[PDB]
Amino acid sequence: IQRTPKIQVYSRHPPENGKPNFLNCYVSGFHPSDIEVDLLKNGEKMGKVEHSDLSFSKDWSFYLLYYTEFTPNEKDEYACRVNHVTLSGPRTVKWDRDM
Amino acid sequence: FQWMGYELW
């Protein structure tokens, strides 16, 4: 039994251009635990990306939170790339300030 | 705190 990970890329606070903020990628409901997650700016891995300690929910599905510091603006594009055994190639989810 | 004891399957 292996399960496809759900991905949510979002900011900690309501995004304002030129205002320091925190970029988060929440990857949940996946199995097994083996997984790779990256935070990209304009298609390139960001400098300092860290993640939370591996944990799981009631249905035994794992969840991880990768995070970094970012200052949003209209020109730059942020995204989250996830590699998992259940995924046919890496899946990339762009950050949307409306979500 | 954590639980201590032998828990073998």
Binding site: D98 | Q2, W3
Partner: protein, 276 residues
């Protein structure tokens, strides 16, 4: 009111990579306070909360000891598992275990937890009676019989009604301002046109604790499920949580929709409407 302490163990075998990896995390309610990673440069129980960080060296030494003990236990259980399901040692497998206690309002054990799964599927779990066990398959029945033979439910129950609750109360005392705090969600409704005939209404609730929260949409005061999307509650990264719920609405119908949000920190339930 009611509080809880839970421990999550994850052991993953790594054929060729040597010993299996063991990761343990501790939670008071929705706040992580400890961690243990066998792959850490110097494996040891680490503080992840300010209110547990000032515990004496004995706490961390003993905690580390028990953590490693649990790790080895899960290794042995991994082997035993390989032997139960008749599997190869060249394959990777996973053992997960969650266990804890729920301190009630009267300072007594409300509910106990001790459940374990193998490869993402239920293996064996402690029943609500705190006396009996439930085995998912024929392989888990061996373990069930073993634990029945050595009175494990009784002993672990002794842990539940004692040490567990004691430490939970201690944590709740030391982390009064943090754990017994109920932060209300900062909410607001946003509007995002899909076309010239439809537009999405998104209800935002941010920076709230604990994670428990209710968020719905209503048309004309009637509950709405159709054309709706609710995302899983997500962590803010600073100890808080977030959640938003969107609904696709015909252009001109916006003012007939209301977002309803109930949270522990809310003095009164919230009734929100798009405020252009």
């Amino acid at each position: 009111g009611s509080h809880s302490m839970k421990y999550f163990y994850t052991s993953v075998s790594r054929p060729g990579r040597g010993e299996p990896r063991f990761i343990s995390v501790g939670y008071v309610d929705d706040t992580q306070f400890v961690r243990f990673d066998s792959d850490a440069e110097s494996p040891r129980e680490e503080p992840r909360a300010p209110w547990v960080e000032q515990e004496g060296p004995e706490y961390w030494e003993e905690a580390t000891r028990r953590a490693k003990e649990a790790a080895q236990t899960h290794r042995e259980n991994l082997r035993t598992a390989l032997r139960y399901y008749n599997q190869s040692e060249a394959g990777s497998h996973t053992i997960q275990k969650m266990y804890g206690c729920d301190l009630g309002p009267d300072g007594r054990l409300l509910r106990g937890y001790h459940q374990s799964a193998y490869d993402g599927k239920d293996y064996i779990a402690l029943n609500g009676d705190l006396r009996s066990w439930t085995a998912a398959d024929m392989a888990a029945q061996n373990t069930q019989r073993k634990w029945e033979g050595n009175r494990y439910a009784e002993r672990f129950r002794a842990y539940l009604e004692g040490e567990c609750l004691e430490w939970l109360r201690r944590y709740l005392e030391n982390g009064k301002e943090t754990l017994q705090r109920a932060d209300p969600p900062k909410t607001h409704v946003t509007h995002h046109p899909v076309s010239d005939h439809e537009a999405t209404l998104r209800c935002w609730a941010l920076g709230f604790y604990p994670a428990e929260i209710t968020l719905t949409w209503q048309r004309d005061g009637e509950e709405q499920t159709q054309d709706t999307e609710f995302v899983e509650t997500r962590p803010g990264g600073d100890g808080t949580f977030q959640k938003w719920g969107a609904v696709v609405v015909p252009s001109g119908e916006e003012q007939r929709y209301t977002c309803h949000v109930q949270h522990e920190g809310l003095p009164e339930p919230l009734t929100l409407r798009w405020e252009p």
